[PDB]
């Protein structure tokens, strides 16, 4: 068991049962912080590159370009690990204290000052425009290799570690890749009718609004990694059974409680996911149900944020 490079060691993350959440241990968490670049995105950093290699769009010479932060760091280490140049477009602004980290992974950040994603995606596209032959944009929000990896690793890990007893999957949605791949695995590959729960911010509940056929109005929020403010292609609505919304403050406080009461070094959206699972878990409906929660990242990515 020796990996040729850091990308092949993705996954195999543990399930830890919570003591201060849910009811008689029906809430268990999957620590995705325990991945090569320390978030769940390590899995898609690996597989998006591998697939691009496999179908010929990524080759020796061509530079990976994209806009993103956990996904940036994931692509950063895979680029380094497999020998690719990489440009990651990013604003000047929020989700910072991460520059020298990405800089430390040898990424060249397109120092893009209207500070937001379009400003980057414009520069991403413009860079992408400049020379199609030299650049490849892996497009996490829609690239099928994103959900595919969760279908093949994240989901099967959950099935095996519970021995087919998972009844519920709770996961924040950024790309939707995580919940989509997981659900497909458990429901379609293993054939078990579980409840898949997408989590999103109450500040920007675009999935809740869409399914209700209500006006889609997104907004700013503090739960880094989720709440994109649109329905991403890698989000398969068809497998989603329920959508829970959680506010930034409660999410942050849930993350702090995860540290102090559970000794689990969780990131902000990990708190969002737990707060929603705790709510579900305290419904008699879910009393005899095993609830599995994805904890996307880890506390030290958040030192300079409201979490601390």
């Amino acid at each position: 068991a020796i990996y040729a490079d850091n990308s092949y060691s993705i996954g195999n993350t543990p399930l830890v049962r919570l003591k201060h959440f849910g009811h008689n241990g029906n809430v268990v968490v999957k620590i995705e912080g325990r991945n090569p670049s320390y978030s769940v995105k390590c899995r898609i950093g690996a597989n998006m590159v591998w697939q691009a290699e496999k179908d010929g769009t990524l080759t020796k010479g061509k530079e990976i370009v994209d806009a993103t932060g956990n996904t940036g760091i994931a692509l950063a280490y895979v680029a380094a690990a497999r020998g690719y140049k990489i440009t990651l477009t990013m604003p000047e602004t929020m989700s910072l204290e991460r520059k020298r980290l990405l800089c430390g992974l040898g990424v060249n950040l397109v120092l893009t000052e209207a500070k937001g994603m379009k400003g980057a995606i414009a520069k991403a596209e413009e860079i992408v425009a400049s020379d199609p032959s030299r650049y490849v944009m892996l497009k996490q929000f829609e690239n099928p290799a994103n959900p595919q990896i969760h279908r093949e690793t994240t989901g099967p890990e959950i099935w095996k570690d519970t021995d087919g007893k998972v009844d519920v999957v709770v996961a924040g949605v950024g790309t939707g890749g995580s919940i989509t791949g997981i659900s497909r695995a458990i429901k379609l590959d293993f054939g078990k009718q579980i409840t898949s729960v997408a989590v999103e911010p109450v500040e920007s509940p675009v999935i809740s609004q869409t399914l209700a056929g209500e006006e889609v109005k997104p907004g700013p929020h503090k739960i880094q990694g989720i709440g994109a403010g649109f329905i991403p292609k890698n989000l398969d609505l068809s497998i989603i059974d329920r959508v829970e919304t959680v506010d930034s403050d409660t999410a942050l406080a849930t993350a702090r409680r995860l540290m102090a009461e559970e000794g689990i070094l969780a990131g902000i959206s990990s708190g969002a996911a737990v707060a929603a699972a705790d709510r579900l878990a305290k419904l008699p409906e879910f009393a005899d149900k095993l609830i599995v929660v994805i904890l996307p990242s880890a506390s030290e990515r958040y030192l300079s944020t409201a979490l601390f």
């Binding site: 994109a228 403010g229 649109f230």
Partner: peptide
Amino acid sequence: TFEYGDGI
């Protein structure tokens, strides 16, 4: 605060 693809 985060919004629209950034933070992911």
